[PDB]
Design an enzyme around this catalytic site. Structure first.
Site, mmCIF file in Angstrom:
data_model
loop_
_atom_site.group_PDB
_atom_site.id
_atom_site.type_symbol
_atom_site.label_atom_id
_atom_site.label_comp_id
_atom_site.label_asym_id
_atom_site.label_seq_id
_atom_site.Cartn_x
_atom_site.Cartn_y
_atom_site.Cartn_z
ATOM 1 N N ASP A 1 0.815 -1.203 0.000
ATOM 2 C CA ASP A 1 0.000 0.000 0.000
ATOM 3 C C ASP A 1 0.856 1.263 0.000
ATOM 4 O OD1 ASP A 1 -1.904 1.913 0.268
ATOM 5 O OD2 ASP A 1 -2.461 1.398 2.347
ATOM 6 N N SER B 1 -0.584 15.508 -12.189
ATOM 7 C CA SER B 1 -0.821 15.128 -13.567
ATOM 8 C C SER B 1 -1.067 16.380 -14.411
ATOM 9 C CB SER B 1 -2.000 14.162 -13.633
ATOM 10 O OG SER B 1 -2.360 13.909 -14.973
#
Length: 330
Positions: free
Chosen positions: A35, A199
């Site tokens: 994770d 992004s």
């Protein structure tokens, strides 16, 4: 040193991925959920409330000759999905795919919430976010990667998750046969303890690319792709019959519909998520309504590039003095 381990989807939908981890002496092998969105290595154990164990493999520290109680230490974690666990702490030898850390904090669960009990395939979590998020008190503990880092050939790990198939976590090296083209690296902020990056935009199917900054986290422990409501609406508007269902808790669509791809920007580069990766199957057995793999992050407080996005790429988690993230197509 290096390590390399195969990671395997827990079910036919890729709801999560499990990776075998050796703990203790002699080795006890548990299947952990790696994770990158958290920083605790915790396990089902011989100390876990009996009624809360249902099929999981447990770590028994009393059977490990290298286990040592971390005296006074406790831990307690709550995850974004509402799940939680807590307990005490041992240090022990932990190996992943041939890479060994001695003295790793192994957080033994005394209590786990229902969702963990109900998932027989996940024996614990291995956190790979920054150690600043680790919940051990009074002395915060380091992640497996943080402990291994100095010994690794290069201070990196890579995530290569499969679509409906196994993939690979590598530590300490970049497998240049595992991706196409080049790896584009992008800046990381560690200020929230996550692999947080920006992004450069998105496209829906064959549509034109929209240049817009989307701050989010690279999180292998989250199944879906969670993005701003504007972006998500633009995606599902291209799917006939798709709708946001309050009762279901997100966008659903008829399985007879064809899903467009979704492209996200990494600098000037582009990662294309095929439409099929966005299908998470019937909302309930026999239903014609399918759950979508791109959902709104509104109310989460952060955008999450979860498995839906990451499995479309070869991803480098670069733990150099100034961390960065790398993405390649594959």
């Amino acid at each position: 040193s290096t390590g390399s381990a195969t990671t395997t989807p827990i079910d036919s939908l890729d709801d999560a991925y499990i990776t075998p981890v050796q703990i203790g002496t002699p080795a006890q092998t548990l299947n952990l959920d790696f994770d990158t969105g958290s920083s605790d290595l915790w396990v089902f154990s011989s100390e876990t409330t009996a009624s809360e164990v249902d099929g999981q493999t447990i770590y028994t520290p009393s059977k490990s000759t290298t286990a040592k109680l971390l005296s006074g230490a406790t831990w307690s974690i709550s995850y974004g999905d509402g799940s939680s666990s807590s307990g005490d702490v041992y240090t022990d030898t932990v190996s992943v795919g041939g890479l060994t850390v001695t003295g790793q904090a192994v957080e033994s669960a005394k209590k786990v919430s229902s969702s963990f009990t109900e998932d027989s395939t996940i024996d614990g979590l291995l956190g790979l976010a920054f150690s600043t998020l680790n919940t051990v008190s009074p002395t915060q503990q380091k992640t497996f990667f943080d402990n291994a880092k100095a010994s690794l050939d290069s201070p990196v790990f890579t995530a290569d998750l499969g679509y409906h198939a196994p993939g690979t976590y590598n530590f300490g090296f970049i497998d240049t046969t595992a991706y196409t083209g080049s790896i584009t690296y992008t800046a990381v902020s560690t200020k929230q303890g996550f692999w947080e990056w920006t992004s450069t935009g998105y496209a829906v199917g064959s549509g034109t690319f929209k240049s817009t900054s989307i701050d989010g986290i690279a999180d292998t422990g989250t199944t879906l792709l969670y993005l701003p409501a504007t972006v998500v609406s633009a995606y599902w508007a291209q799917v006939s019959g798709a709708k946001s269902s309050s009762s279901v808790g997100g966008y659903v669509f008829p399985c007879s519909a064809t899903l467009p791809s979704f492209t996200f920007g990494v600098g000037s580069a582009r990662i294309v998520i095929p439409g099929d990766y966005i299908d998470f199957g019937p909302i309930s057995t026999g239903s014609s309504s399918c759950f979508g793999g791109i959902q709104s992050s509104a109310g989460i407080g952060i955008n999450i590039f979860g498995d839906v996005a990451l499995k479309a790429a070869f991803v480098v988690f670069n733990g150099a003095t100034t961390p960065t993230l790398g993405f390649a197509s594959k």
